[PDB]
Write a protein that binds this ligand. Sequence first.
Ligand code: F6C
Ligand code: CLA
Ligand code: CLA
Ligand code: CLA
Ligand code: CLA
Ligand code: CLA
Ligand SMILES: CC1=C(/C=C/C(C)=C/C=C/C(C)=C/C=C/C=C(C)/C=C/C=C(C)/C=C/C2=C(C)CCCC2(C)C)C(C)(C)CCC1
Ligand SMILES: CC1=C(/C=C/C(C)=C/C=C/C(C)=C/C=C/C=C(C)/C=C/C=C(C)/C=C/C2=C(C)CCCC2(C)C)C(C)(C)CCC1
Ligand SMILES: CC1=C(C/C=C(\C)CCC[C@H](C)CCC[C@H](C)CCCC(C)C)C(=O)c2ccccc2C1=O
Ligand SMILES: [Ca+2]
Ligand SMILES: [Cl-]
Lengths: 742, 57, 115, 368, 42, 80
Amino acid sequence: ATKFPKFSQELQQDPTTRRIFYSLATAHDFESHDGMTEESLYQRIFASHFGHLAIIFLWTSGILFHVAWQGNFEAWIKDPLNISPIAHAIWDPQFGPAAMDAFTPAGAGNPVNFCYSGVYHWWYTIGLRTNGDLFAGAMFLLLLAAVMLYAGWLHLQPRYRPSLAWFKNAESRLNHHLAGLFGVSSLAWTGHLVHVAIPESRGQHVGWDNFLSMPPHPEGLKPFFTGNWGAYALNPDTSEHLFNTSQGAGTAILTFLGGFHPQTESLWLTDMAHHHLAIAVIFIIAGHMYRTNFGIGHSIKEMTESLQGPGWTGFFIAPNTGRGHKGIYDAYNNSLHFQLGWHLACLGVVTSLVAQHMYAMPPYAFIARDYTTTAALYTHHQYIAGFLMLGAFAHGGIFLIRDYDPVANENNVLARVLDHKEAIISHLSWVSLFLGFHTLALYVHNDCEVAFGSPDKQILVEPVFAQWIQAVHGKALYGISSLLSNPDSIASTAWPNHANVWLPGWLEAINNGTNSLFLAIGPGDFLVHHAIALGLHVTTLILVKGALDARGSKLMPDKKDFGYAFPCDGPGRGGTCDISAWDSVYLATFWMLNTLGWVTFYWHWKHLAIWSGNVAQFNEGSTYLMGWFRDYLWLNSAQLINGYNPYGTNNLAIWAWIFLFGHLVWAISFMFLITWRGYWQELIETLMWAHENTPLSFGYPKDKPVALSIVQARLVGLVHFTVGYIATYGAFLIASTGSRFP
Amino acid sequence: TYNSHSRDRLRPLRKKEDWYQLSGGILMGSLGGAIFAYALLENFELLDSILRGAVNV
Amino acid sequence: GMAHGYFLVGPEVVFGPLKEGSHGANLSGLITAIYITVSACLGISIFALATFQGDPRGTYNSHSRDRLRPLRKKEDWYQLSGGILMGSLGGAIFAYALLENFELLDSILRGAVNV
Amino acid sequence: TVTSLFTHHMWIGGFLIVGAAAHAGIFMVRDYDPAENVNNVLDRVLRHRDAIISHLVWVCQFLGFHSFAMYCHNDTMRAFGRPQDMFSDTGIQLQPIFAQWVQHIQTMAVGSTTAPGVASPASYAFGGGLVAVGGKVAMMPISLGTADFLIHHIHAFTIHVTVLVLLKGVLFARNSRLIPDKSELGFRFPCDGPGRGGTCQVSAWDHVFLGLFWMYNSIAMVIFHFFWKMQSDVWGAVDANGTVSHITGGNFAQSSITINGWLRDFLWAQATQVISSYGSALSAYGLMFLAGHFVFAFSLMFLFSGRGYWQELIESIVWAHNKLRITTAIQPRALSITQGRAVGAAHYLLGSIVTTWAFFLARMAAIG
Amino acid sequence: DATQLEGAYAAAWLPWIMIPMITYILPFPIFAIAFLWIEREG
Amino acid sequence: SHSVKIYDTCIGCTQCVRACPTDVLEMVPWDGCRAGQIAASPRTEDCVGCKRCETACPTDFLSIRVYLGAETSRSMGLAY
Ligand code: F6C
Ligand code: CLA
Ligand code: CLA
Ligand code: CLA
Ligand code: CLA
Ligand code: CLA
Ligand SMILES: CC1=C(/C=C/C(C)=C/C=C/C(C)=C/C=C/C=C(C)/C=C/C=C(C)/C=C/C2=C(C)CCCC2(C)C)C(C)(C)CCC1
Ligand SMILES: CC1=C(/C=C/C(C)=C/C=C/C(C)=C/C=C/C=C(C)/C=C/C=C(C)/C=C/C2=C(C)CCCC2(C)C)C(C)(C)CCC1
Ligand SMILES: CC1=C(C/C=C(\C)CCC[C@H](C)CCC[C@H](C)CCCC(C)C)C(=O)c2ccccc2C1=O
Ligand SMILES: [Ca+2]
Ligand SMILES: [Cl-]
């Protein structure tokens, strides 16, 4: 018996090398820990959250510190179109001088990394102008991380650990998060936007030495108190306004122009300040709905338990749902896995929204012209979102294993979807099969037509519904005079009101065929959207099937007694490999990775063809699969794989090396994924024979060498597949874009 | 503290053999660590060119 | 240690990044032998620290019949670690000193010092 | 034709050699009798197989570091910009002096010596002269440098790990330290449950399964070595004077020593003729190139997934069928564990070999 | 031009010592401390 | 050690006991089925977890379940 891990007596008795690996992958599962009460669980999670926020603040502080010490922020604000932002400096002692020269730009005296995270554009759009500003922000975030660390340590002290009834307070928390984490924080961000960001955008310097001096508006808090609020939307920035300079400047602080600043090709800062103000007011209002200890307010529990039956006082949009939502509040509030899998689904939808919105409506100055930054940011957030959506269903399964109560949830919506789960799974299966057969067969027909010298015989189906939705927003690209495309329509004019003051600015941007806001779509878009539909449907099939069959199926009726992750149930009953619910999240990680590959491949090729000017490359080349293979993967690889050749090294040498590194890790995954445990256990037995019988080999394993377990090697191979899949595509996307468009 | 009845937890070398083995070890280790620091300071020009990658030309 | 630190100097002297020049090559080989010695002896020390806790498990248990592993006590392992460290650092600097003075050792073994 | 014949006979040989181990394991489980053969060579091999297998494990590791990790060394040194530190013919040279000496003995033997009867060398690959027919090179000396040392040690490594995988299943087909009664379980059985840590793929059949992949990985590198070396250092176009312009231009000696040069100067560069073949007469090769990629990727569905997922999804599909009263008497069951393994292996091999076939044949039918 | 590693930034001697400490001097002590922590007996 | 549980749907066919490679299981008198026998698992410290006993069980669902638990040197099947 070792003393490690201290959270599990059964792993301390483990005499093998399995306990080291199982103590690393069961360390944060506090529920299944020795002597864990619910209160102690919540308190530990609270302190862990504080340490996590400290890590986030330390990370942001380090980014700020390395741009302020080793970047070129002050040199880049002078020309943010012809200067590459610098992340930090290289100190690899193993470089030859040919790599030291390759990673040194024209305006630098040391090897550096080019920044592709977009923080230069973000910091330039919010007022930060000097390295001293960046250093001050970094030191503030260092101290704020220290504050979060002290808070986390403090709430582990006996007089300061919150009670369980405090953690169960779902009415006070929603009020304080809606009004005070989303409202007051957004109100403070509007305050910064009108005090620092918009002034510094016009050329005036506002700091913590003259902000009490400088008023944000010529009539300081005169229009707001008097009630004439339209004065703040008067004299905006003119079209010929040059960012960070006063030429073309205005005086307005809250205006609603719509569209983009024509010089930075980004959203207007007056629009973003007005946005965050109208968001702050609505969220501060919304954080006044539930009662805490002042009598007024709602009770969430009484609202949910009131959706039981029929009638207008009952759940009338689905009266045949039995007990309706009775027990759903307690399923949410008592189960931390229900909350986590619910919040992960919400966050994974919001992260995809972030990715889908920040390329179409760029919010930062000159970030639409940083092509590699735009591509990296979209791909980053879409992969983060796919992982969050995968973990949403993971913890939906873990809730149904660990916290689901079939009697507290008797005949409600949750127990009503668990009843007919075969209908849900078979209909996801039907949608998946239909989409897959049709999309693959259309692509293969197009391949066989183009290969046999008939590109004209391809089946090219236009996305007429999405082209029409492009038209209902005011796109005149097609011959569809729909709602906002029709200039004297009920939607365009706002007949009684005539207050859509967003319409001319928004139609200046959607009709502008040079931004990414509602890109033109054709036949090659319809097929890849159906492929994305297939991918999301099959990933949902795997995850929904494994969550709904988590508690048991016909092949293993008592699957809830074996846990969430377990290898199998042996080779009986035909064999039960990958039968656990954890293995569904395992099997759907491949499909998430494949779907996000399709998504990001589509986005990247669409934009590479747009940015090069040769949009017909993607147009008449994405309808068949060899065009994807040859005009995207083969073609935009020539600069990456020539990062180092027998003639020299350019600055793409690390991207070529990481491309090969990701290929290596992805291949190593297949070793854990195809070869299984007994092969390696017999190999390790021969190795144990060899070691005990060799002279001069005085070491001996304290813990017995065993092969990695079944679930362990599934996780190890999946982690390898993921890491190599991310590394290969991250190296290709940064180098295929940063070389064509330096 | 080196009497047999002593309860000092902070002085655990109770035998003279421990003290002679300690003296020999401190002598060997200290003379070696001194000449290791001396050798790193004598070759500081080389250790500097190494840690700057100046040897990869 | 003497035998080991002696030969561990050579691979970096011939093959290392400093191999284009004699003085730097011998220094890179010396510090490679020094680093490998200190790492190996740190491993010997932590093997003895982790293994000999109560009655050890495996070949250093009191009931073990392994003839090929005769250092049964932790005192043997600590004395071994100290000896391997001393001998290996000395053998490494002896090989380094013979390679630094290779011009002199060469003129000696050719009788060029008898003029 | 030369490419196709060499490649075809290497694949047939590798498959046949894997079947040899397959039937050496079937002999063990079924036809081996301990009472028949007592203290003979067959009994004495089974009676020290831990020594055989552990020494094969060590030699596979030694060969894997001293072939492939040297390629990784070369990649890192070439990306650093220090090619004097590489294992090249211009960096740290690794000349195969024994094979070079055999080549010299072969060209000295045939003099007007040790073989006075022969006029020419037994092949011009050893030495001698250049035979060019119709302008194109029939045969010329195959120079062996550092790249050839490195790729022959790749070959030794891959053959040895194939032997490890196959011999391990043959030697432990009867029993092991884990499962002492493995011969009672059969030659083709999936596992012996999740106990003893999990005894997945302990049968001899599963070792034939895992050695099929290793024979693929071994023979693919042999046919790649042949294709690139013959295409850059033998095959070409002799002019009137006699100057030989090789097909890829003698780039094996400097590009085939890194993994990046294998991916760029062999795979990316020489697949120009198979992906740019649409609309031509070689378009079937481009179609089969993509088809092989499909079948390779489709194999991974059977190789990475397990049987219980599919049996539990068939439950929902059977429910949807029972509701329409389209129930069938033959009850639909997922593929068994070893059958899912066999299907995955067959698909991987088929797609991955059809890909190389299309790549070789489109390349050689376009640039001659 | 660049014959060796340089720093055109403040306290450019700090990478020179920080990269050895973080990457090949302090890690094997940390590995030894973690190994002694996971192998200590009750 | 693993946990081997025997439920009252047992019919005393002995097939789980005959299939056990490590002798965990035996038959005890029951008078709860007409065979008069039910399986028992006293030497469950010997259980490796192969689930041969579960493969040998004819009842639907199984009258014997193995729950893989804390791994010891016996349940990992280690001769080293
Ligand atoms: C110490 C202890 C010990 C000892 C003594 O003492 C030993 C020894 C042996 C002998 C006898 C042999 C031969 C040698 C050679 O050649 O090869 C090398 C390798 C190595 C690894 C080498 C080793 C060496 C040592 C480790 C040294 C040390 C170093 C330092 C100390 C570190 C530092 C520390 C810090 C803290 C970090 C062996 C081997 C084998 N291994 Mg074996 N080891 C061991 C450990 C380990 C671990 C952990 C693992 C896991 C990874 C394994 C694994 C393995 C495998 C797979 C195999 C094979 O293959 C082989 C064989 O079988 O044959 C046949 N194994 N090995
Ligand atoms: C292929 C998808 C993809 C892409 C294009 C990016 C892109 C980016 N990420 Mg990343 N990331 C991803 C997936 C992706 N991410 C996933 C799935 C995770 C969850 C683990 C992360 C977690 C993550 C963190 C913690 C951070 C980023 C950061 C960044 C930004 C700077 C790095 C860079 O310039 O380019 C290079 C992109 C690569 C993918 C290079 C390959 C390096 C391999 C993948 C290392 C393997 C580690 C692991 C698998 C993921 C690491 C990603 C990240 C460190 C680059 C950049 C916009 C940094 C940032 O936010 O800047 C301020 C940052 O700190 N990401
Ligand atoms: C998490 C943010 C972060 C990241 C990813 C980096 C990364 C890097 N730093 Mg840096 N650093 C940071 C924060 C960060 N730093 C902060 C806030 C400071 C101000 C004290 C510094 C001060 C600093 C100096 C003086 C140097 C670096 C250097 C480096 C580079 C080499 C590694 C090194 O020597 O570490 C050195 C680290 C320190 C001296 C202090 C680090 C303090 C941070 C906050 C620790 C963060 C811990 C993290 C949150 C916990 C994660 C847990 C785990 C799961 C990973 C590397 C790119 C070197 C360089 O510039 O290369 C050319 C260099 O010498 N950093
Ligand atoms: C006004 C009072 C207030 C405030 C500000 C907070 C704030 C917080 N609480 Mg708390 N709480 C409160 C009252 C409050 N609470 C009360 C009264 C109770 C008792 C019922 C609780 C009980 C409680 C518990 C049990 C927990 C928290 C937690 C948290 C943290 C979670 C959110 C987060 O991590 O940061 C970030 C979130 C935001 C910044 C807003 C997110 C909005 C979206 C998702 C992002 C914004 C979108 C926008 C596009 C962003 C662009 C920025 C980009 C450009 C950089 C957070 C700092 C958790 C914690 O402990 O952390 C330590 C937690 O476990 N609270
Ligand atoms: C807010 C986010 C969040 C939180 C708090 C949790 C929390 C938890 N999850 Mg989880 N989950 C999430 C999101 C989250 N998850 C997402 C986004 C996914 C999909 C990927 C999952 C899928 C998932 C599964 C399938 C399981 C959990 C489990 C758990 C529990 C234990 C985790 C653990 O074992 O400790 C610590 C584990 C580790 C420290 C492992 C780290 C290794 C990871 C996998 C990869 C590391 C990257 C790699 C090193 C990069 C190197 C590259 C480069 C250097 C080359 C814990 C309560 C487990 C559970 O509840 O048991 C019933 C469980 O089985 N989660
Ligand atoms: C590229 C992917 C990849 C890699 C690297 C490996 C590697 C290995 N395989 Mg494997 N395999 C793979 C794919 C891969 N396989 C696939 C896809 C399958 C599917 C069927 C298999 C099936 C398989 C079987 C059945 C067997 C192996 C065996 C082996 C081992 C061979 C021994 C050896 O070469 O020693 C050398 C090690 C390497 C070449 C690994 C890379 C080492 C790098 C180059 C050096 C790293 C430097 C340094 C240590 C890094 C330290 C950094 C620090 C921070 C950690 C080896 C570790 C055999 C074995 O066990 O042999 C004894 C075995 O029988 N494999
Ligand atoms: C308390 C503490 C601290 C401090 C620390 C310190 C105080 C430090 C240090 C340090 C030190 C002070 C270190 C050292 C070292 C050393 C070494 C590393 C050594 C060596 C050596 C050698 C290797 C030698 C060798 C030899 C011999 C022996 C013989 C012959 C000669 C020769 C040379 C070869 C802090 C606050 C920070 C934090 C943590 C805790
Ligand atoms: C098996 C065998 C073999 C091999 C062998 C070997 C492997 C070898 C070797 C070798 C070696 C490997 C040797 C070595 C050595 C050494 C020495 C000789 C040392 C030394 C040293 C010294 C003298 C040091 C000193 C010092 C000190 C300690 C302190 C201070 C510093 C000084 C420097 C002074 C053969 C086959 C051949 C045969 C026989 C058997
Ligand atoms: C997809 C998959 C399945 C499901 C595959 C099945 C069930 C086989 C698919 C073959 C189909 C069902 C063909 C049979 C249909 C009839 C023969 C009718 C065909 C129509 C013709 C007569 C025209 C597994 O069973 C399996 C098992 C173990 C590991 C991996 C996997 C795996 O990946
Ligand atoms: Ca050098
Ligand atoms: Cl190269």
